[PDB]
Amino acid sequence: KYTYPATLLCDFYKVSHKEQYPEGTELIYSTWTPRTSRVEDIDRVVAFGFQGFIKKYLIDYFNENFFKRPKQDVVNEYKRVIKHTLQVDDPDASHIESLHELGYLPIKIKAVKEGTFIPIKVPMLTIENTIPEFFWITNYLETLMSNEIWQPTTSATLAYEYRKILDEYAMETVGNKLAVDFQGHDFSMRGMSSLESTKLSGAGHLLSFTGTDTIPAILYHEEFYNANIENELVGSSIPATEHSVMCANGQDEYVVFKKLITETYPEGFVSIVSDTWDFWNVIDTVVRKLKGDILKRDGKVVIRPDSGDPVKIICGDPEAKDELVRKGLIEVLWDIFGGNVTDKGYKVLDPHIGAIYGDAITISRCKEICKKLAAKGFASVNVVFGIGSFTYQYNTRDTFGFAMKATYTVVNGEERQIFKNPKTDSQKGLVAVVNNGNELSLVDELDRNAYKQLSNDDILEDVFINGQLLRNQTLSEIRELLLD
């Protein structure tokens, strides 16, 4: 098998930095901070992902690929890469040798509880070396950790933006939040940039919702967050057709739909994409004609449109003159099947029929759909939203301004602050995050004495020290912390 050395998962210049530090550098202490927000109406992030990164890479990857292997092997892989990529005849690997001899990562990582709302410009995590000789290790890990933990948090925040909307309109139209868990459904896996990013993003999505088509995300929560699908609802989905299946089955859409709902899935949920040729014809002449069969099933038939303006398809096009197009999918389905009326006067479809829209959904479009459904007396729970790769893939580390910055060093016993301040266009010292009334706040410019003085109010907790994981959060606990 091909091994990527655990000592070279970084930018190239991280390798060179060790010899550049001042003589007698004994400690380097770095923080992980979302420094700004580039999503409207989002001023906090949902901290998530540190545990998965620590378990997969700092514990498992370093043990299996570095510490349990012979010293000569890891030394040689490192030296080979350095020699042939940095043009060094005899690279120094004595620090690698010494780390391997130590047998564990002399590292202290602290972090806020995953599931916590962290304000912009407030640090969520810190890392430091626990043995002076390995000061260089802190800087070394900055790249990989950044590379790994901005995506799960980012997705976690974006998903929550949906949940917050879906909760509120639910409370506004129904009076309870029972349907919201399934109202946000992850459709994004094919549009994520890699399977690993698929796992991290979908795992973020699953903090707020249980509906997903991203199987590896459910299994990710099993792998790193102590979930078990046999004992708790981690994630769930329903049988659903796709355009190629509908096309293969042919244009006698009544026969195809009837076979799908009475023979292939006579009970339970089933989602049928209905726009392969003529969506409104399927609604008018197929779904209507199958009304008795749909009502006779012990389950739900979910109608899935996949083209047009999602807002206008779901809520209606006011300027369209065909009655079905002007009414919209939800109103036409109510006209066919009816349903129930909430205590606040909003219509909920008969539970034998339902709708889902999983193309071109955005946070703004989700809010608009809920608002326009309420404007005509339909409850928000009548639509399931399919959230795609536009939400979960199309971000950067800068979408929430994440950066890992060294804020504190100890050099020959002297405590020192680190910060840049370019004239061509910040955190200092040890940091702490304290609960001040309603919100969390950053305290910086702290020496070791002042940092210890504040230890009882700091909400960052010991997560990983010298190879030992000290905090092991479950998915249920994180969901509890997020949604109370």
Next chain:
Amino acid sequence: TKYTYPATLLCDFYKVSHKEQYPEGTELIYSTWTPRTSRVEDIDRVVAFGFQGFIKKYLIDYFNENFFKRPKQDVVNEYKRVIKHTLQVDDPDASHIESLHELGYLPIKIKAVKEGTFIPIKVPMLTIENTIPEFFWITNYLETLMSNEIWQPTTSATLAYEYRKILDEYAMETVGNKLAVDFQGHDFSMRGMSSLESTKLSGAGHLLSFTGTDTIPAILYHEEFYNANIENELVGSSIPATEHSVMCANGQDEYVVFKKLITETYPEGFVSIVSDTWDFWNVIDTVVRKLKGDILKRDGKVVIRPDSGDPVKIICGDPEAKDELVRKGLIEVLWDIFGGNVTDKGYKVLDPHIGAIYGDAITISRCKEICKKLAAKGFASVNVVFGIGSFTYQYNTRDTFGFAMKATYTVVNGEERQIFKNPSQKGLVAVVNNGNELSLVDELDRNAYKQLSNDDILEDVFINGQLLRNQTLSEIRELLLD
């Protein structure tokens, strides 16, 4: 733990339900991978890259190690557990998983253009189908993961090439050769990639066009899947470089810090020093200027790395500034101190003992603008190395080049049929050399397709567990640039 993600569950959930929804007697499903549109200006072709890595890693390595070599009962149970407790089925059917395991290999056929080829928008570049009728369902099942894994390596490879394109033309125009270009596009993006795997795929795409990179895992990726060997070829290269935290740790007497770095820590070779920790222009005026003799005595090159301000103005100058150094820009000021040479085209190139690199807020547009404005001042484009970061490589979707996996062809009870929605590609597809361009041919039945096979530039890459094409990084670089 040794947690195993089942090889049969790397997909969208509804892929699992599609098998029973196909018509009776479905014997073949055939799908294509096409970039349908371009959302990047001046780009109407993509660099085909990624298929070999996905095929080796997942279709060969992953499936053999985690599915075919394991006990049949174990894979069956791992499938049933997930389906039962996530699709709320009491007794899931796994007889097809059992049949696949008994078969012992993936009964699929994948064709793809050679990696490194330029594929125009709306031209397919990969197809997949099943080779045994019973396993018609395999094609559809594999669509998610394949799409998950191959849009990013191509996108990066395409975006990287755009930089190369600009850097090539300007080199040809201001130097007369492209020798310096390989190191002019330098990948800085790893910390901003969404995952280590995405880091690897994107950096490999970048390394198709450039040799300069700070993303070590990308170099090693080309070793793992594209037969590269850093002992015998230059896959990726980088140089010693400082960062802001180290500059702060060394203190504000930047004369002594720089002197130590360039005469003691790295007395020879390349060394990149980021110089804007407190005052970039002061560093240029009083540190680099005072160190000119020391810099010129080195058998090597000191590279100056600014990291803040308008990149175009820092590198090429700010015409409206009153300070002479700010007005001139870094390249001209360095020229004033160190001098240099004139190329065959009449453009100035810095003395090889000094250099410049800029790796913050670089875009394709800014790289072109920097080259253009440097040329307008008489300075060759090779005076600047461009650090390309995550804004280029990460801030994309599969929709940036409109990638889609579309079933286009099926065989049901021996009847050939075309698959397409009209709420497009129909039938079997081929890509042929049509004068000077590549053209899509579709609406082909099997007979016409076989007739055209010798002209199709799509080639057999994977069949029934057999790797049929094994391209090297050097071959792909040769196809792309030559």
